[PDB]
């Protein structure tokens with residue numbers, strides 16, 4: 001071996017080695033206090049993280065307007081009880097709202113006979129409504145009932161009366177909230193006498209019953225000065241207007257149309273929708289329909305969609321249908337009036353299995369809106385780009401940043417995005433791995449360069465880049 | 470007498486691996502219902518694994534355990550590589566993971582939704598390590614009388630996950646677990662990403678192999694030691710499943726993958742007072758995982774030096790107190806080298822690959838000792854077709870983990886291939902370098918003088 005001895009060591013060890021054994025024993029114990037104070041200084045010099053805002057249920061996800069119950073599932077199975085079977089489909093969409101149509105037995109312009117407390121017998125009863133609310137509560141889907149009283153007449157809110165129709169609504173606020181609906185909507189508030197002071201009485205009883213309730217109000221006013229006069233008294237009101245219903249096919253228009261709305265309201269919580277009760281197939285063609293679903297799901301606010309929006313259900317395609325309430329295309333026999341009129345991709349059954357369809361873009365965007373912290377309440381900072389295109393950054397404190405580049409032109413335009421107009425906390429690097437794109441033909445997950453970004457016509461692409469230093 | 474022995478096995482198996490694993494099991498298996506299968510399959514494999522280790526402990530009984538079983542079957546080369554890995558790879562990176570767990574869990578209340586600093590974890594984990602090796606070297610009676618303090622912490626913490634878990638079972642909080650229809654997630658992970666969920670599911674079960682040869686004190690073995698395995702290790706799998714059910718009744722599975730500390734994200738919910746005792750009762754559990762792994766790190770430097778390998782400057786024992794200094798100074802230098810480099814969850818894949826690789830060659834040694842050398846007195850036996858289930862599970866996991874992450878397993882096999890030149894310099898060398906061999910004598914006596922340590926009597 002290599003031993004010395006026990007006894008031979010102690011007569012040879014430590015004549016002056018005891019000086020080096022004490023001095024090196026303190027050099028360890030002094031460097032450990034330098035490693036202890038040097039590890040508390042790093043924690044304090046590490047800055048902070050931001051406190052998460054108090055998120056309500058409509059802040060996290062999208063709502064889903066269901067106008068006509070009989071046309072959502074079909075005239076054979078059209079009931080409130082038949083709506084319960086489709087709750088498994090909407091939970092795949094990961095929507096959080098169920099803003100269903102008014103069901104309060106209107107009598108076609110007779111103010112004394114439209115009681116808002118009593119459900120129409122053509123839809124069901126009281127007992128199937130609460131079990132619909134009990135069934136939706138297990139899947140965490142919130143049901144919003146709207147109380148626009150004259151919904152089958154040519155003008156809502158009963159133009160011959162000014163006061164009895166108003167207290168007909170106010171009595172029904174404390175009636176349906178007993179049954180536990182999680183909000184209310186009032187469409188067409190442009191046809192009201194003293195509209196901006198009647199929402200403030202209705203948002204009292206909606207918030208005063210419980211804090212987790214909401215009120216939605218719909219106009220058709222597309223002017224900026226009319227909307228802000230409605231939001232100058234109330235603040236926590238979702239107002240779905242017709243503000244974006246114009247063309248916006250030039251790129252610098254919609255950049256100047258969206259960033260004027262957040263700048264005038266002071267970056268509050270808004271709701272992004274192209275209309276109040278109309279689909280996205282109106283107001284814009286079918287090649288920009290995948291470009292707006294990427295825009296509406298990434299803007300700061302609650303995106304509101306109508307039924308048949310995820311599949312691009314055009315009312316002007318199938319003949320013999322009312323324009324406001326088209327039939328939802330469930331299977332090949334969902335429209336049994338004209339045989340041989342629907343395609344395979346023009347059906348929610350064929351849209352589901354196609355990995356490059358339009359429903360596959362909705363479902364792949366709806367989960368990333370609902371689960372990602374930088375899209376839930378991340379800051380919005382749009383910046384300049386080339387001749388016509390829209391580009392903006394969604395960013396939060398430390399989370400995964402997002403960068404959307406939307407091209408509204410028709411030529412294969414290069415992006416040319418300049419990062420000089422950003423704050424230093426959320427600047428972009430040279431590489432950012434792609435996440436999704438509207439038209440396929442790009443390698444997803446591949447980190448591409450952000451200076452040479454050649455873009456196709458009608459091609460909006462979603463990139464992400466991590467927090468760096 | 471058996472009930473006293475069952476506590477010996479469950480006490481050292483259950484440590485701070487239940488606090489690290491369920492983020493990495495859920496990330497690699499995808500769904501919640503597939504992750505609860507992984508904790509059941511791994512616990513059955515450990516029962517199969519700790520059975521075939523008990524048969525070699527009654528057939529060829531020698532001190533050293535895992536290292537001496539390979540020493541009997543091609544024991545020249547293969548026996549040294551079992552100990553070359555357990556000195557550089559296994560024992561350092563088992564302490565660095567538990568040390569990095571300690572800094573990650575005390576810096577979850579501070580910095581709850583942001584990220585902790587990248588060098589505030591490499592310096593707070595090196596403080597738990599460098600303090601404990603100072604405690605460990607010193608009067609070893611101190612190092613065991615403090616270990617039942619850390620054992621009370623992991624019993625207080627794992628009880629609180631259970632009793633607050635079972636309260637949420639008798640409520641409406643059984644949404645994600647009990648429904649059995651919420652079992653869908655990212656399926657682009659292949660089978661090869663489920664193989665990485667077994668590299669991290671058995672980090673929580675690790676520490677079963679060097680226990681069974683210690684239970685020697687047992688009464689009448691050859692029937693009991695076994696009867697003890699069939700009671701202890703399925704009682705670990707009962708706890709690890711029930712404490713993982715309680716993790717998902719508190720938070721979302723996507724919420725579980727975001728936090729760096731799973732046990733205290735549980736604690737910031739379900740009461741307001743458990744924000745104070747969820748970091749404390751789990752940072753105590755990570756103190757015992759490093760303190761309990763610096764006892765057993767020095768028992769392997771003893772068995773290696775008396776057999777030719779591992780030159781005799783190691784395995785020396787201090788003159789006033791029975792403590793090995795230079796065996797603890799090699800698992801403290803080599804642990805700091807593994808600590809500053811890489812990420813914790815990809816360090817478990819670095820252990821669990823090479824830990825399975827020598828798990829197999831001892832069970833393969835249990836079958837080749839039945840082909841070669843029969844009629845040896847064996848007090849207990851298993852089925853002939855029983856350890857070939859373990860070799861079936863070992864082969865289908867090793868080649869799939871090499872396909873998934875080849876870089877973290879390519880450096881695990883690169884250090885084993887570094888073993889064959891240092892072994893051939895080790896014992897197959899002619900002793901004609903007179904100018905080089907007295908360097909070893911000069912290296913020893915200077916280490917024997919600046920440290921007063923001496924070889925033991927035997």
Ligand SMILES: CCCCCCCCCCCCCCCCCC(=O)OC[C@H](COP(=O)(O)O)OC(=O)CCCCCCCCCCCCCCCCC
Nearest residue numbers: 021024025028031032602603606607608798801919920921
């Ligand atoms: C801290 C700096 C950053 C980290 C750097 C790594 C530090 C590793 C330290 C590990 C923990 C050390 C604990 C020492 C105290 C033990 C406590 C105790 O019970 O003492 C008993 C015993 C008490 O002695 P007594 O007071 O005489 O009774 O302590 C000793 O006898 C010696 C203590 C000092 C040990 C000297 C170690 C010198 C290492 C220098 C290496 C130089 C290069 C070598 C190259 C080799 C190439 C192969």
Ligand SMILES: CCCCCCCCCCCCCCCCCC(=O)OC[C@H](COP(=O)(O)O)OC(=O)CCCCCCCCCCCCCCCCC
Nearest residue numbers: 002777778779780781782783795798799802891895896909
């Ligand atoms: C740092 C901790 C200090 C306290 C502990 C001191 C430990 C010192 C040795 C550490 C390594 C222990 C394992 C040694 C290898 C074991 C294999 C074996 O069986 O050996 C038996 C063999 C014979 O032992 P014997 O039976 O006791 O004579 O022991 C040795 O030959 C030890 C050789 C020391 C060097 C090991 C290999 C170093 C690799 C790096 C080479 C660098 C080349 C020069 C580069 C430039 C330098 C300027």
Ligand SMILES: *[C@@H]1O[C@H](CO)[C@@H](O[C@@H]2O[C@H](CO)[C@@H](O)[C@H](O)[C@H]2NC(C)=O)[C@H](O)[C@H]1NC(C)=O
Nearest residue numbers: 197198199200201202203204205207208209233
């Ligand atoms: C309901 O809204 C009104 C404002 O529209 C709030 O203020 C009340 O206003 C009425 C006159 O319209 C006064 O008679 C009340 O005394 C006011 N209430 C006060 C000062 O507390 C009213 O606070 C709202 N209700 C709740 C519960 O907040």
Ligand SMILES: *[C@@H]1O[C@H](CO)[C@@H](O[C@@H]2O[C@H](CO)[C@@H](O)[C@H](O)[C@H]2NC(C)=O)[C@H](O)[C@H]1NC(C)=O
Nearest residue numbers: 154155159188190191219220221222223226242
């Ligand atoms: C909102 O819809 C109405 C219905 O067509 C538009 O027309 C208004 O209709 C009411 C009642 O029929 C009249 O009292 C108004 O004078 C009409 N407006 C105009 C400008 O003539 C109304 O224009 C639509 N709102 C917007 C902003 O286009």
Ligand SMILES: *[C@@H]1O[C@H](CO)[C@@H](O[C@@H]2O[C@H](CO)[C@@H](O)[C@H](O)[C@H]2NC(C)=O)[C@H](O)[C@H]1NC(C)=O
Nearest residue numbers: 224228256258259260261262263264265266267
């Ligand atoms: C939109 O935001 C900009 C700055 O963020 C502000 O616009 C300023 O409006 C005043 C009004 O006369 C001009 O004098 C300034 O030159 C404008 N600023 C810039 C940079 O052009 C304002 O906060 C918002 N605009 C409005 C009309 O409120």
Ligand SMILES: *[C@@H]1O[C@H](CO)[C@@H](O[C@@H]2O[C@H](CO)[C@@H](O)[C@H](O)[C@H]2NC(C)=O)[C@H](O)[C@H]1NC(C)=O
Nearest residue numbers: 286287311312313314317343344345346347358
């Ligand atoms: C579903 O796919 C079919 C492909 O067969 C599309 O049909 C083509 O549509 C374009 C105009 O959109 C026509 O110019 C082609 O002649 C059509 N081809 C055939 C074979 O009919 C159809 O447009 C797709 N559906 C939707 C809603 O876009």
Ligand SMILES: N[C@@H](Cc1c[nH]c2ccccc12)C(=O)O
Nearest residue numbers: 484485486563672673674675676
């Ligand atoms: N070191 C063991 C695992 C391990 C050690 N200590 C632990 C404590 C608890 C859980 C697991 C462990 C291995 O390499 O497999």
